[PDB]
Amino acid sequence: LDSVLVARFCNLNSKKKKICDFGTNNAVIPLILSKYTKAKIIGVEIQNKAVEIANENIKLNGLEDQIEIVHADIKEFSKLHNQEFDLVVCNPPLITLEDIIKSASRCLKNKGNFTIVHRSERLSEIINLFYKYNIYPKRLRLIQSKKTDNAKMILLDGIYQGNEGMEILPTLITHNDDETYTDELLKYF
Amino acid sequence: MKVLNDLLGYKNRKLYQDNKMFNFTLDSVLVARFCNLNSKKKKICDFGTNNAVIPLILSKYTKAKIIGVEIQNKAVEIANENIKLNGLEDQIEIVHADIKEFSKLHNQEFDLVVCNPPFFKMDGNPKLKEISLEVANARHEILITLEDIIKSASRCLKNKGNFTIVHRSERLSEIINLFYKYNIYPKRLRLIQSKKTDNAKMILLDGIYQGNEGMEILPTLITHNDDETYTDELLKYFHD
């Protein structure tokens, strides 16, 4: 469910010509993104098991000329790809949160976009690491279970070598108090 | 010109407010109620207190000594009238001072600093859109800057002291980042939206001087139902 939220949150304008997914598993995010962009997508997965399915899913869906898997560690991969991507998106799980954000800055084009989903307790630390690697936080969205609940999940978008100022989108409430998904959540999926 | 009015539905609370100065807002009320007022907070400080609406509300919940710092002398006079009028002279004191220089002179004195800062930076003629220099000096960063407020809050606070702020949501990371720069660890956060479909316009943020990491993101506050009426959650803050 995280992966559907982070996918639809990605700001997919026409400047996106090359996108990357950190720790792509079955390539669910690339496949979802596929339905909104013509940019070439690259998914990076450290485990061969997941590589077969993701490749299988790109085969089954006939996007082999748009999406591609790469069997690598995000850290080593990113040192090899300076100023490459318009978007890096990562749905985190030997790789720390600082590693993900550093790696993202090592391989984004200037004014490119880094999109992450994570636990709400970690918002201030992610914001400090964004700034430590010259990523300027831009869009935030909170995820709450019910209207009376503390947020569990945050969605965070930032621009590498961008300017200052945030946009905080209307909080998302996943389900009503009957434990039925809210109409708002249904727009996703 | 001063007018006397009740401080929303807070019982035994009235306050004068001048039409050519800043009049309190929902922001003032919510940042007062968002403060943590546990028994350890023994001394409190309001940065830029104006007519002292924030102390007047905090006092309904704690017996701590409350100091209000304010720079515009016409407001200190109104503030001191409101404290006497409500008989709070024993608890609340007003000091005509600059936040910066006050903080340099009263270092490590407080367990809690709260602040409803001027929201807008300086960019052109600030008075062009205001009715009076005294309003412009409350809404724009002409006599104080955001970094000054946070730096000053760190000079005034004591270990495990608590800085509480309300501000525009566009500047949340800037604020987060200035917190870390002065060793204030963000802890509690709540977004305020007008409507369930609107972008958050305001944030409430709290953090601990020389504390630890870890954030609690409280449920978003919607202030209006789609029918344009105050929500029931908001009306809970209109009284004690």
Ligand SMILES: Nc1ncnc2c1ncn2[C@@H]1O[C@H](CSCC[C@H](N)C(=O)O)[C@@H](O)[C@H]1O
């Ligand atoms: N440098 C400074 N030192 C002390 N107060 C200052 C200041 N610069 C601005 N202020 C004051 O800060 C206030 C900001 S408006 C906040 C009003 C009030 N605390 C409320 O919640 O409604 C103004 O009254 C302004 O005079």
